[PDB]
Unconditional design. Structure first.
Ligand SMILES: O=C(O)c1ccc(Nc2nc(-c3ccc(Cl)cc3)cs2)cc1O
Length: 327
């Protein structure tokens, strides 16, 4: 069946230890070197704190991992090891445990994040190009390392808008890509789930992340965040189909032999494919260009195999102004 157009065999070409995360044995340092200063957030798998390393005064973030099999912990740790030094990937400083309870935690570099809801209403055209280019560097890097992030969304994209620093965080849903492998579709935030997930197509690849990135680009240039605002996973696909079109959805399903859950029959309706220019109005016109729309059109495609790769996206004319500034 389906495979990635890029980096398809890269894990098969590496040593097994690279991708056999169940066999990984982390070295767990001592969490007692860190003083927790403030809670930043919590989710189903972790709680995150700002902290200080008392031995060297470094400000960090500590992600204390909630009870889960050690398998998911080893996965995230091994992925982060493999991504060491990757451009715009959050830096893992250490893997530590409370030395009595043995509860594990991950220590990351600090980023002075600007809350994205505030940020995404004040970005300039050049800012959007710049930050999308920076995020693409992280995705091209992880994809080249054989890893799908599977949870790309604004929260997971820390941006320090003063220092112009971007980091892709929270690798707890990330997996290794292996050709023909069937993956769990219960990944990503609703609003950033690709159509493949919503139609229960398990043989997905790095291109899932490119759908999510496209959703972010749409939200930035159009100032509608999130761009596709489903009420549940079923409605999420309806929201997509009202833009990309229903006949076009059916062509995708037919190509990949995808079985459609019959609950969709009652809710998808009939929708023409919309022109991306339909989303332009006076509040967003200064962020939208022909180049932006061309790029977006090539990301927000049903057919995962037809989406741009991260590299192809980086190579698009939309980013020429950014490349020129960075050269
Ligand atoms: O899972 C992960 O790998 C993970 C990694 C890092 C991380 N860092 C965060 N930084 C903040 C923050 C917000 C506002 C200010 Cl002012 C400063 C920091 C929020 S979250 C969170 C993580 O969940």
């Amino acid at each position: 069946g389906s495979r990635a157009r890029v980096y398809a065999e890269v894990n098969s070409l590496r040593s097994r230890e690279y991708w056999d995360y169940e066999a990984h044995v982390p070295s767990w340092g001592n969490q007692d070197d860190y003083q927790l200063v403030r809670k930043l957030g919590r989710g189903k798998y972790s709680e995150v704190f700002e902290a200080i390393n008392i031995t060297n005064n470094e400000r960090v973030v500590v992600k204390i991992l909630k009870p889960v099999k050690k398998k998911k912990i080893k996965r995230e740790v091994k992925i982060l090891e493999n991504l060491r030094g990757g451009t715009n990937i959050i830096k893992l400083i250490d893997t530590v445990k409370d030395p009595v309870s043995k509860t594990p935690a991950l220590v990351f570099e600090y980023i002075n994040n600007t809350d994205f809801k505030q940020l995404y209403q004040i970005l300039t055209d050049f800012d959007i190009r710049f930050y999308m280019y920076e995020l693409l560097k992280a995705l091209d890097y992880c994809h080249s390392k054989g890893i799908m992030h599977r949870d790309v969304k604004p929260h997971n994209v820390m941006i320090d808008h003063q220092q112009k620093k971007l980091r892709l965080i929270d690798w707890g849903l990330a997996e290794f890509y292996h050709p023909a492998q069937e993956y769990n579709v219960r990944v990503a935030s609703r609003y950033f789930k690709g159509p493949e997930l919503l139609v229960d197509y398990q043989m997905y690849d790095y291109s899932l992340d490119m759908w999510s990135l496209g959703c972010m680009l749409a939200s930035m240039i159009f100032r509608r965040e999130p761009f596709f605002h489903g009420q549940d996973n079923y409605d999420q696909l309806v929201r997509i189909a009202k833009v990309l079109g229903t006949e076009e959805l059916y062509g995708y399903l037919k190509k990949y032999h995808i079985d459609l859950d019959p609950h969709f029959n009652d809710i998808l309706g009939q929708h023409s494919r919309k022109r991306w220019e339909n989303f332009i109005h006076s509040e967003n016109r200064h962020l939208v260009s022909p180049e932006a729309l061309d790029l977006l059109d090539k990301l927000l495609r049903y057919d995962h195999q037809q989406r741009l790769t991260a590299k192809e996206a980086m190579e698009h004319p939309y980013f020429y102004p950014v490349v020129k500034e960075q050269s």
